[PDB]
Swiss-Prot record, chain B:
Free-text comment on this protein's domains from its UniProt entry: The prion domain (PrD) is a Gln/Asn (Q/N)-rich domain, which is unstructured in its native, soluble form, and which forms a parallel in-register beta-sheet in its amyloid form. The first 37 residues of this domain are sufficient for aggregation, propagation, and transmission of the [SWI+] prion.
Subunit structure: Component of the SWI/SNF global transcription activator complex. The 1.14 MDa SWI/SNF complex is composed of 11 different subunits: one copy each of SWI1, SNF2/SWI2, SNF5, SNF12/SWP73, ARP7/SWP61, ARP9/SWP59; two copies each of SWI3, SNF6, SNF11, SWP82; and three copies of TAF14/SWP29.
Family assignment from sequence similarity: Belongs to the SWI1 family.
Record protein name field: SWI/SNF chromatin-remodeling complex subunit SWI1
Annotated compartments: Nucleus
Lineage, broadest ranks: Eukaryota, Fungi, Dikarya, Ascomycota, Saccharomycotina
UniProtKB/Swiss-Prot annotation, chain C:
Superkingdom as given in the UniProt entry: Eukaryota
Protein name: Transcription regulatory protein SNF12
Function: Involved in transcriptional activation. Component of the SWI/SNF complex, an ATP-dependent chromatin remodeling complex, which is required for the positive and negative regulation of gene expression of a large number of genes. It changes chromatin structure by altering DNA-histone contacts within a nucleosome, leading eventually to a change in nucleosome position, thus facilitating or repressing binding of gene-specific transcription factors.
Gene (name only): SNF12
Disulfide bridge map: none
Assigned protein family: To yeast RSC6.
From Swiss-Prot, chain E:
Miscellaneous note of the record: Present with 217 molecules/cell in log phase SD medium.
Compartment annotation: Nucleus
Assembly notes: Component of the SWI/SNF global transcription activator complex. The 1.14 MDa SWI/SNF complex is composed of 11 different subunits: one copy each of SWI1, SNF2/SWI2, SNF5, SNF12/SWP73, ARP7/SWP61, ARP9/SWP59; two copies each of SWI3, SNF6, SNF11, SWP82; and three copies of TAF14/SWP29.
Stretch of the intact protein here: 537 to 584 of 1703
Functional summary from the UniProt entry: Involved in transcriptional activation. Catalytic component of the SWI/SNF complex, an ATP-dependent chromatin-remodeling complex, which is required for the positive and negative regulation of gene expression of a large number of genes. It changes chromatin structure by altering DNA-histone contacts within a nucleosome, leading eventually to a change in nucleosome position, thus facilitating or repressing binding of gene-specific transcription factors.
UniProt name for this protein: Transcription regulatory protein SNF2
Naturally occurring in which organism (per UniProt): Saccharomyces cerevisiae (strain ATCC 204508 / S288c) (Baker's yeast)
Superkingdom of origin organism: Eukaryota
Covalent link location (Glycyl lysine isopeptide (Lys-Gly) (interchain with G-Cter in ubiquitin)): K7
Swiss-Prot record, chain F:
Other information: Present with 3150 molecules/cell in log phase SD medium.
Modified residues (Phosphoserine): S61
Functional note: Involved in transcriptional activation. Component of the SWI/SNF complex, an ATP-dependent chromatin-remodeling complex, which is required for the positive and negative regulation of gene expression of a large number of genes. It changes chromatin structure by altering DNA-histone contacts within a nucleosome, leading eventually to a change in nucleosome position, thus facilitating or repressing binding of gene-specific transcription factors.
Protein localization: Nucleus
Quaternary structure and interacting proteins, as annotated: Interacts with RTT102, SWP82 and the N-terminus of SNF2. Component of the SWI/SNF global transcription activator complex. The 1.14 MDa SWI/SNF complex is composed of 11 different subunits: one copy each of SWI1, SNF2/SWI2, SNF5, SNF12/SWP73, ARP7/SWP61, ARP9/SWP59; two copies each of SWI3, SNF6, SNF11, SWP82; and three copies of TAF14/SWP29.
Name assigned to this protein: SWI/SNF complex subunit SWI3
């Protein structure tokens, strides 16, 4: 079931609840040297998706690392590390507060799209004189 | 402490100077050199992790400025164009004051003429070809003279005077670091020393900005005596040169304030005790050289 | 700036007398220091 | 005599200034001509690509 | 009949990506080269 | 043009051969060593016997003479340049 | 071509710029043999670049 409108600070638009990215490993490598068998990318992803789901459930109100610690753990240390990490990356606890505005209007508006000088791809505002017709066209 | 920032500085240097061509506009290179030396100016504390390479880099960076053409290799800069050549010596003082047994020591090894790093170092010195730090001396000898002593007054001096003293400071400091096979002497119809006339200028100013004047003149005198005696004793220890050196030393118009000036000095200001001692010992060495010459 | 007195950096140095008039200018600077100190 | 020497040095100065003006002029002309020669020889190389 | 549409949205995304290659090469502002001289504080700091 | 089927509008004129001849005459190489020249009409006989492409051969020859005249003026000009 | 590689801009047209509009038909070998002939004519009419 889905019952909320979830936004994220766009630059984060590299994260995918399905997969992992070179970003986080360079920020949390301690699950990837394959040295500590009790840790693995897999349990990492488990924790990850679990927590993000939790937050996305009722994101209007905050979510603590202590919460997850109560819920599931294999460690406090790494748990906190990654939790605060995602916090930084706003994937979690980002919409804890709401802010609004009346937004008065100005001459530029999103529904304004007219004919005017253009920086984009080519366009020809002057077509052809008379003698151009003088060609054995295709 | 932004170990990251320092790594950045280091490798950026290692590129900009050893630059296989990937940079488009030389002006970009100038920009890099320029804002780099500036941001250096705003540092007044430690540097030189994995030092030696970085130390040589910074030296080449400051040496970037000033017109080249033994003897002094640097035409003194006609001070109406540049302002970075300033920043150069500014840093070579500030970021070099730390007598901690690292930086000074790195340059001291630069007197000479993972582990592969060491291979690199000498690799560049012979790739800069004797000695080299004489070039640093010559560079330091720029922006001071030949314009203020050639002006119409001593007031417009004070501006660049404020700038001047750190230079002499740097110089005498590095002369603590020269006390082995060399050939060095740097008063050979190359600068003379208007330092005496300059000292006279600041003196007349005294009895007629501030807070820098007395130290400037003092260290100027100390510089004179120390470089003199060090040259003499050095080529004594080597003894590769005829005693003509004395005669040679005795043959400078820019030297040895006249004893009449000493006398008249000894009377009027009476506010320069330490400076009086400076000139005193100076004249002492002068008269000594005169005597023991014969 | 440096542009104003000279620009001689490299011109292919065809008929490289530029070194010579260079030296001339250098000795002019020499004479300049000379007269100043005189 | 020092005053005399200063006076005659000042006497000769403006001629030097004029010569410096001429220097600047001929230098700029040299510079333009250099540009032109570079252009032209590059044309000499293989006019297709240069064009 | 659809062609102009693809051309249009193409131009949209094209200008969009092109915008990324703009890093103020267009201009060359001053970068606060404040230190005309090093002030008194610099020298006295060196001595101190 | 030929690299541009879009050509300048015309009903009776002369454009390409015009500039062709301008550059040609400019060459002044009265003994221009190039594509076959004239010493006996048999040269033209064999040329026509060889001239069988629609225009491509002709075009190559044209641009060749173009480049030639350029090169000549270039040499002379750059000589004057070094002189200056 | 001239237009086929330029739009919303163009070389002016009062001089012999149509040389551009005839940009290439044998570029490499053409220009090569042209340089051959150029150096050849140089050496021929020739019989250091100063007097």
């Amino acid at each position: 079931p889905q019952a909320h409108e979830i936004v994220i600070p766009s630059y984060s638009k590299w994260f995918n609840l399905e997969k992992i990215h070179s970003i986080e490993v360079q920020s949390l490598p301690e699950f990837f040297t394959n040295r500590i068998p009790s840790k693995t990318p897999e349990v990492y992803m488990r924790y990850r998706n679990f927590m993000v789901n939790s937050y996305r459930l009722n994101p209007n109100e905050y979510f603590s690392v202590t919460t997850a610690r109560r819920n599931v753990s294999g460690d406090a240390a790494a748990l906190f590390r990654l939790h605060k990490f995602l916090t930084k990356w706003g994937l979690i606890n980002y919409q804890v507060d709401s802010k609004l505005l009346p937004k008065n209007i100005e001459p530029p508006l999103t529904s304004q799209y007219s004919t005017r000088h253009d920086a984009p791809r080519g366009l020809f505002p002057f077509e052809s004189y008379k003698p151009s017709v003088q060609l054995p066209d295709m | 402490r932004n170990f990251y920032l320092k790594r950045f500085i280091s490798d950026l240097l290692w590129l900009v100077l050893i630059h296989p061509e990937n940079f488009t506009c030389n002006r970009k290179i100038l920009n890099f050199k320029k804002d780099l030396v500036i941001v250096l100016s705003n540092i007044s504390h430690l540097l030189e992790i994995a030092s030696s390479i970085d130390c040589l880099l910074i030296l080449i960076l400051v040496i970037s400025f000033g017109q080249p053409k033994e003897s002094l290799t640097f035409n003194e800069f006609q001070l109406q164009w540049g302002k970075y050549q300033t920043f150069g010596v500014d840093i070579l003082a500030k970021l070099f004051s730390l007598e901690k047994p690292n930086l000074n020591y790195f340059k001291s090894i630069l007197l000479n003429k993972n582990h592969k790093d060491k291979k690199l170092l000498r690799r560049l010195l012979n790739l800069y070809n004797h000695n080299l730090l004489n070039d640093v001396v010559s560079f330091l000898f720029s922006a001071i003279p030949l314009q203020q002593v050639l002006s119409q007054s001593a007031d417009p001096s004070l501006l660049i005077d404020q700038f001047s003293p750190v230079i002499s400071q740097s110089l005498t400091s590095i002369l603590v670091i020269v006390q082995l096979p060399f050939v060095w002497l740097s008063s050979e119809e190359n600068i003379g020393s208007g330092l005496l006339k300059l000292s006279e200028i600041i003196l007349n100013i005294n009895n007629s900005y501030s807070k820098v004047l007395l130290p400037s003149i003092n260290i100027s005198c100390v510089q004179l005596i120390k470089c003199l005696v060090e040259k003499s004793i050095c080529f004594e220890n080597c003894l590769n040169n005829d005693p003509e050196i004395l005669k040679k030393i005795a043959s400078i118009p820019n030297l040895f304030p006249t004893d009449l000036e000493i006398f008249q000095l000894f009377t009027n200001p009476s506010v320069d005790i330490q400076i009086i001692n400076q000139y005193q010992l100076l004249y002492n060495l002068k008269n000594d050289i005169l005597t023991n010459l014969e | 700036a440096e542009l104003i007195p000279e620009l001689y950096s490299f011109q292919q140095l065809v008929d490289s007398e530029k070194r010579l008039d260079h030296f001339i200018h250098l000795r002019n600077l020499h004479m300049k220091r000379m007269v100043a100190q005189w | 005599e020092l005053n005399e020497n200063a006076r005659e040095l000042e006497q000769i100065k403006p001629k030097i200034a004029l010569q410096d003006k001429e220097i600047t002029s001929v230098l700029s002309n040299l510079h333009e001509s250099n540009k032109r020669y570079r252009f032209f020889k590059k044309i000499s190389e293989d006019p297709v690509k240069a064009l | 009949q659809l062609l102009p549409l693809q051309k249009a949205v193409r131009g949209h995304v094209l200008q969009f990506e092109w915008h990324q290659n703009s890093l103020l090469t267009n201009t060359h502002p001053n970068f606060l080269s404040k230190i005309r001289n090093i002030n008194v504080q610099d020298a006295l700091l060196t001595n101190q | 043009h030929l690299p541009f089927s879009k050509s300048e509008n015309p009903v009776l004129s002369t454009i390409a051969f015009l500039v062709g001849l301008v550059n040609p005459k400019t060459v002044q190489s009265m003994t221009q060593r190039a594509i076959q020249s004239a010493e006996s009409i048999k040269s033209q006989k064999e040329e026509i016997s060889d001239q069988k492409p629609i225009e491509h051969i002709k075009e190559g020859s044209e641009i060749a003479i173009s480049s030639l005249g350029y090169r000549s003026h270039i040499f002379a000009t750059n000589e004057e340049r070094q002189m200056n």
